[PDB]
C-alpha cells in the first residue's frame, strides 16, 4: 500500500524533467541574444578604434 | 528570463535508468550556462558617439556610423526547440492516466482484501476448510494426492 501511494506522490513531480528542459533551452536563447549584442558593439567600438588610432 | 524553483533531489529520481546520463549531461547544460549568463552584463553600453567626434576628426564616418548602428537591429533567436510539450502531457498520461487508474485499481483490491483479514473468526472458532479457503497455500491439492494425508510425509 505504501509504496503505491510512494509512487503516486512521485508522480505528481512527474514534470518537473520538462521544466528544467523548458529553463535551459530558454535562458540559451537568451545568452545568444545577449552575447550578440555584446559582440556587434564591441565590433563597432573596434572599428571606430582603428580610425581613431590612425 | 523566468527561471523557477526546482528541488533537485527530487528530479533526479525521475528518469529511467537509461536515460540518466544525458538527463546530467543536459543538468551540467542548465548549471554551465547559468553561470555563463552570471558573466556577462545585461547590455552592451552605449557608444560615445559625442567623443568620438570630437576626437575623430573624418568628415562624417562618425555619426554615419552612429546612425547606421542606431538602425541596425538584432535577429533575435526563435523558439525552435520549444516543441516538445505534449512530452510533459503525454508524460501525464503516462503517470496520471495509464498509471493513475491501474495503481488506484491495485489499491482498491489490497484495501479489500486487507480488510478481508480483520473479518477472520478467531482461530478458536475456525476450521480446516477456514484456513482453506483463507490461505489456499493450506490446501492439500488431493488431486495431486488423492490419498491420504495428501502431502509427501516427509513434507
Not at chain 1, 505528481?12 to 533551452?25: A, G, P
Not at chain 2, 556577462?40 to 576628426?57: F, Q
Request: with cysteine.
Amino acid at each position: 500500500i505504501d509504496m503505491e501511494k510512494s509512487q503516486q506522490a512521485l508522480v505528481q513531480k512527474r514534470h518537473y524533467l520538462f521544466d528544467v528542459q523548458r529553463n535551459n533551452i530558454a535562458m540559451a536563447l537568451e545568452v545568444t541574444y545577449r552575447e550578440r549584442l555584446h559582440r556587434v558593439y564591441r565590433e563597432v567600438k573596434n572599428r571606430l578604434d582603428y580610425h581613431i588610432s590612425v | 528570463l523566468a527561471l523557477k524553483t526546482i528541488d533537485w533531489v527530487a528530479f533526479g529520481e525521475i528518469i529511467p535508468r537509461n536515460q540518466k546520463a544525458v538527463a546530467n549531461s543536459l543538468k551540467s547544460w542548465n548549471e554551465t550556462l547559468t553561470s555563463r549568463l552570471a558573466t556577462l552584463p545585461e547590455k552592451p553600453p552605449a557608444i560615445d558617439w559625442a567623443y568620438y567626434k570630437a576626437n575623430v576628426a573624418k568628415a562624417g564616418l562618425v555619426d554615419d556610423f552612429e546612425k547606421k548602428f542606431n538602425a541596425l537591429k538584432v535577429p533575435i533567436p526563435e523558439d525552435k526547440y520549444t516543441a516538445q510539450v505534449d512530452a510533459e502531457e503525454k508524460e501525464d498520461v503516462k503517470s496520471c492516466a495509464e498509471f493513475l487508474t491501474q495503481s488506484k485499481t491495485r489499491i482498491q483490491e489490497y484495501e479489500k482484501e486487507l480488510e478481508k483479514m480483520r473479518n477472520i473468526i478467531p482461530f478458536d472458532q475456525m476450521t480446516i476448510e477456514d484456513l482453506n479457503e483463507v490461505f489456499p497455500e493450506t490446501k492439500l491439492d488431493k488431486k495431486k494426492y488423492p490419498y491420504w494425508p495428501h502431502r509427501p510425509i516427509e513434507t
